[PDB]
């Protein structure tokens, strides 16, 4: 969770709406086990 520690203080004539980009990644001790068919793709008929 990302909470407002204090606030988003801004001077005059500056937009009060900003954005934050969240990026994710794995650390250096990341490892994986048995393979598996992904569930993010679907196909009904052959791609002709």
């Amino acid at each position: 969770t990302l909470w407002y520690q204090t606030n988003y203080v801004v001077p005059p004539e500056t937009p009060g709406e900003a954005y934050i980009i969240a990026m994710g990644a794995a650390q250096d001790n990341f490892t994986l086990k048995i393979c598996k068919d992904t569930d993010e793709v679907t196909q009904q008929a052959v791609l002709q």
């Binding site: 086990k33 048995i34 393979c35 598996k36 068919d37 992904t38 569930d39």
Partner: protein, 296 residues
Amino acid sequence: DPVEDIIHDALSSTVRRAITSGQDVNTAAGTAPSSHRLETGRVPALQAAETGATSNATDENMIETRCVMNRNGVLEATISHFFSRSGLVGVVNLTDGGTDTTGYAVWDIDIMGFVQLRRKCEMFTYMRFNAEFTFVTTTENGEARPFMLQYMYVPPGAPKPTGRDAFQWQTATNPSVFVKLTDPPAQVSVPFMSPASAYQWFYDGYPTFGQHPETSNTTYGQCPNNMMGTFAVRVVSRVASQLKLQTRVYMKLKHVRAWIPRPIRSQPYLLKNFPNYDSSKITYSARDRASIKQAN
């Protein structure tokens, strides 16, 4: 140095010696001759079961014995050679007829379905091993007929097939076995695939947090570190082949390691995942006799 109650125990909390060293025992133990001993104060027969230790009164200390170079073997008692024999695990029924327009069968991998092997592998609480699976496949009558079959392994997470010719059967990543019905049984080797360090057949606890009911506590004991996926089977075809098929699965446990033995179950089984029984019919382990002092 300034405060030393913190160093006195840090350098004292190393591996504490718990000597229970075993030795390589090839054959059963022999015996040594013994004469009669009329001595006071040294009693090997008087024991005390309240110490939690079993009696150590051997033969030589109780009766006058001869010596015997016992050459009997003990190799067939090791758990390796005890679980080295394959047994039935699960059977699937694939009715690819005209009235059953499904075409595929699905089996949740769970060896707790058949008592013969469950009773053995439940005498130990924590087991770690590699399995050797063998699939025999016949018709309902027991006939073999040259129809090619596909067995797919669906690990936890992968999409399960939805039809006879669905795309999941492409098995681009899932391991799969194509074999004809008129061929030797299909045999593969599967490793120790649990996320934990050992399979446990008894998990005294719940999988998740939260409030747990008291009427239908259907989630108690079900450990996820045991469920290892799914086994799907189909016949490789575009239209239905009208036949009733039956696939039996046998598993051999090799490179076995067992931990924390357990009493062997006496009451019959009633459920697969749960160790249920019935308090109305308690089957005593010992058969009944007429009298106590009348050994039959």
